[PDB]
């Protein structure tokens, strides 16, 4: 389930991060308009970028805190403040992370491997109504 | 405490692994038997491999998983006995994980930061003996 998840994540989370974030990029390509140093590379040349890399793994990280911290895949109040007052995130609406759990979710799925899928749909949800109620446009 | 440093080393992963493996190697240079494509290069060369950064960061991935289980700095036995039936660590005796949690300790203690450097070292002794129980000589 969602905790064998995360440990799953984490164990190689790097990849997983690049792997998903790049899932969620082809998916929504506007997307990269928040991110414009990736524009015009394929994943594999992104995938040789370290600072890709350190990125997307520092945002994966976070999130397998939020995710871990949860109860019942309910985030707490106060990472969902986290999440819209930083300052890297000053300007983004809850449809940039909803697309990032459908491509996640959509990841999980096409996988070979027993992810609870259903659970971080849920996931991905909550945190998106909590963002809402802290005050994300 | 040790949790906020796992989150700490958790926040910029691939540096800390990458480092506290290197003050290991350079710490016990014998250790690099076990390792000999990376014997005859200085650390910044070793920096620059996606091999060295991709084996140092799941080494510590795993590390950090299974200090995050632990209670009071006790890891699980499940988590010893993993360590000990890993296909790559035949042949490792206890000695080798005796001395890069020595060398992790150092590295805190050296580092200018408030890490539980205690509480480390009491886990590296706590793994030790539970790999010692789990079979490893
Ligand atoms: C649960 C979901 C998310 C988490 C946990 C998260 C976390 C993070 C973290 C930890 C950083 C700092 C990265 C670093 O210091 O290297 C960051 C930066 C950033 N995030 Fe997020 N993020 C999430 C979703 C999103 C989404 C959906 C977008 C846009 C579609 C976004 C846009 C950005 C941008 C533009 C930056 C700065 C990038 C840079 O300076 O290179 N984030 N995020
Ligand atoms: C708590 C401590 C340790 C953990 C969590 C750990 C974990 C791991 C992991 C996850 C791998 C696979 C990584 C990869 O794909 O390259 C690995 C491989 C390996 N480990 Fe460890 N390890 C630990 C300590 C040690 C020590 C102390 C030694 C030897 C002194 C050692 C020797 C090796 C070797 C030789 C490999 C194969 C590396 C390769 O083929 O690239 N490990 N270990």
Not at 12 to 23: E, G, P, S, V, W
Not at 26 to 36: A, G, M
Request: net charge neutral; charged share 25%; hydrophobic share 40%.
């Amino acid at each position: 389930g969602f905790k064998q998840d995360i440990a799953t994540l984490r164990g190689d989370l790097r990849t997983y991060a690049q792997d998903i974030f790049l899932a969620f990029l082809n998916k929504y390509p506007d997307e990269k308009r928040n991110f414009k140093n990736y524009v015009g590379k394929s994943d594999q040349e992104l995938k040789s970028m370290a600072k890709f890399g350190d990125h997307t793994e520092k945002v994966f990280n976070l999130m397998m805190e939020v995710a871990d911290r949860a109860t019942d895949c309910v985030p707490l109040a106060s990472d969902a403040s986290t999440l819209v007052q930083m300052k890297q995130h000053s300007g983004l609406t809850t449809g940039n992370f909803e697309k990032l759990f459908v491509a996640l979710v959509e990841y999980m799925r096409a996988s070979g491997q027993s992810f609870d899928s259903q659970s971080w749909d849920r996931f991905g949800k909550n945190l998106v109504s909590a963002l809402s109620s802290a005050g994300m446009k």
